[PDB]
Design goal:
The complex is a heterododecamer, with 6 copies of chain A and 6 copies of chain B.
Chain A lengths: L2 E2 L4
Chain B lengths: L18 E4 L4 E4 L9 H9 L4 E3 L8 E2 L13 E3 L5 E2 L1 E2 L11 E2 L1 E2 L2 E2 L9 H6 L5 H10 L6
Antiparallel strand pairs in B: 1-2, 1-3, 3-4, 5-7, 5-8, 9-10
Classes of the chains: A mainly beta, B alpha+beta.
The complex binds zinc ion (13 copies).
Protein name (chain J): Regulator of nonsense transcripts 1
Family (chain J): Belongs to the DNA2/NAM7 helicase family.
Subcellular location (chain J): Cytoplasm; Cytoplasm, P-body; Nucleus; Cytoplasm, Perinuclear region
Chain lengths: ~10, ~150, ~150, ~10, ~150, ~10, ~140, ~10, ~10, ~150, ~150, ~10
């Protein structure tokens, strides 16, 4: 909900 | 062919990292321009006057409704981010205001490529080719028969 | 940068399979749409009211002036083709019943087998230019062609 | 001059 | 005096169509003629070989086909997985889940993007040979390879 | 050794 | 331990081990603490393919290979059935023109070819993890010993 | 060479 | 062996 | 601490997209510069006079010996690349990429290009062990008699 | 004729100041172009994909494998020199780098003439005449039969 | 080995 953890 | 359920309703591409679910229209669209000057998903959102989308589970970020961390707004035309490797989505206003370097998720009328990938030239030539006019009409018809 | 002489005067793309020589203005233009609704060369041809083009030798079709097989007309807005190999013919009269045809310009771009449509990707790297900026630049080109 | 042989 | 790369069965020498048998050291085409498999594959089954080389001037250049992962050259075990690039892999183990895949020999010929199918037009002009004559000839190639 | 770039 | 003991875990029942002809070491057909057999895991990791059974095994000393063409790739060999076995490549040698079952199923050799060590016999072994196998195979390139 | 005689 | 497929 | 087997022998960075295997000396090195003017891997290659490397399996490009497509040369100081959309072909500058047989070397500004081997961030190099130019030369000098 | 063992494997020229030994294929080649556009030795090196050479003992510089003073690299396509009436051979990179006026040993695809003498037209006119295709032809046959 | 004195 509002946060995106992108990989490398 | 019986193409997968998450294939672009305009042209059929179905790579899960490339499609976006329209939560209002309940159909999928890709982030390539094809023969238009903008991406299919954005054009649909403008044309059908929709605003809330969902990414696909097998995309880089899994299934995720885009919304503001702060207020829960789901209007992608207002959402953006400010920068190592965590990302927080924020409305430009007020939630990203000075009182509360920002950049929208939609630039050049497509979603950022790290959010939803642009399909390759090879991949768009092989898809069903459709014109800007054809989209405009087809969107006009979808009010009468969504099927 | 020192870009080649065959680069799109609007955006700089210089892939020889993608640029077209306008015989009248004496400037090259590519067949990508960019941020407008038509390709750069077509928009130029429409705006400057020109009609005769030449392809680059290093394109799939070599250096080639497009013209009707029958009469030699060079008006790209009148030319078309019929399969068989492709034979180019004016829509009228040369392709008439008495003398399956499709125009060379569809959706205000050249068919891609004639002139390659630049990929979305390669147009992103090219100089970004808006429809306002083309009219911007074409208006000036009569007083200063350079 | 009016006839075209297309790529492969 | 046919070029060095002509099909030892029927003579086709279009370089996009012939394949070198690395063991028997002769060339064969990927057309079927009147048989149920292509000349190269039919040869491979009869003479019991497995490793080949493509022609220098073919679309893929001079190339010994082999697995990306382990270097196996057994064309009957190899396949591929897909922007415009393909990776060759053994069916087992190198293409296994733990280590969309499709074999390189389908309907007993090489896929045409690997080795071009000669056209029916081009095979009628080649020396026509029946199934018996080939087995006949493979039998003879053991005593006199020439 | 194992990667193939196909024609256009 | 005997010279034919599994280089991973030490099992040395001759009906249970397999010789890797390339790396020149022996491995068992038990899974231990991993998801596949030691020998198969070894073959995949070191990228090998040719094996030899042990002489005091039920079939004696035998390099596995195709009856028809002589291929020695265990990932391509198989069989079709009273009491004789003919090994055949899947393609071309087992084709329609030339019910087939691979010798390697569920990442181990069939038990009638090379027996699966018992839970009893795998517990009395040197316990080793999948990480550790991966680790150890990596070192074996410079110092195989 | 390709032949296995089953034990019993 | 000489060909590299780059990230997204 | 017990660092993984693929950690930079100079400074400890072990992000697999950041380290490079020196095939000759059989040790790992990262592509960050620290307080030198070049990356640890490059500096090592010049001083120890090595040339052939291998990337780490868990990097974006997997376990991969860099070598010329045409001749198989493995000298990183001679290899470069040419684009093909997101495919790249490596070639010796001469002869294999010559006019008769737009090219760019893999090592620019004494490091590997970042799309081949990631340059660690200034932040991530600060967390790693700090090493000066003096200490490295010493250590390279030391590695000849006792590689350990 | 019974030509010496060090005769150009293509055309027969055998002046020791003009030929170069290929260390991999173990044959000799001259530094003249003959009827081709490059010298025989280079053409072979490009064709057979070799890189390490040796000069003949009776040449001006004696029997010598060309290599970098610094690292021992023997790849002639990377080597060059910098003047001392003495010359030092160095890799292009790193050994001749700024941190470590350089000119390659191969320019216009032949060895520099002070390294390997170019035979005179008189000597090349008398040699066995061979075309570029015949050389291509002949290199292809040489893996099957090097003889 | 890497140094050459050109002929007199
Ligand atoms: Zn679409
Ligand atoms: Zn908000
Ligand atoms: Zn343009
Ligand atoms: Zn006409
Ligand atoms: Zn044939
Ligand atoms: Zn394999
Ligand atoms: Zn074991
Ligand atoms: Zn077989
Ligand atoms: Zn480091
Ligand atoms: Zn080298
Ligand atoms: Zn090379
Ligand atoms: Zn010569
Ligand atoms: Zn050097």
């Amino acid at each position: 909900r509002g946060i995106l953890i992108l990989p490398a | 062919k019986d193409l997968p359920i998450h294939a672009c309703s305009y042209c059929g591409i179905h790579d899960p990292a490339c499609v976006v679910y329209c939560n209002t229209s309940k159909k999928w669209f890709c982030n390539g321009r094809g023969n238009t000057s903008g991406s299919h998903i954005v054009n649909h959102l403008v044309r059908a006057k929709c605003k809330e989308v969902t990414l696909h589970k097998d995309g880089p970020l899994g299934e995720t409704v885009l919304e503001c961390y702060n207020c829960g707004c789901r209007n992608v035309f207002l959402l953006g981010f400010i920068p190592d490797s965590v990302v927080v989505l924020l409305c430009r206003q007020p939630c990203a205001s000075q009182s509360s370097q920002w950049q929208p998720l939609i630039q050049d009328r497509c979603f950022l490529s790290w959010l939803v990938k642009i399909p390759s030239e090879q991949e768009q030539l092989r898809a069903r080719q459709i014109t800007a006019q054809q989209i405009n009409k087809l969107e006009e018809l979808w009010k009468e028969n969504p099927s």
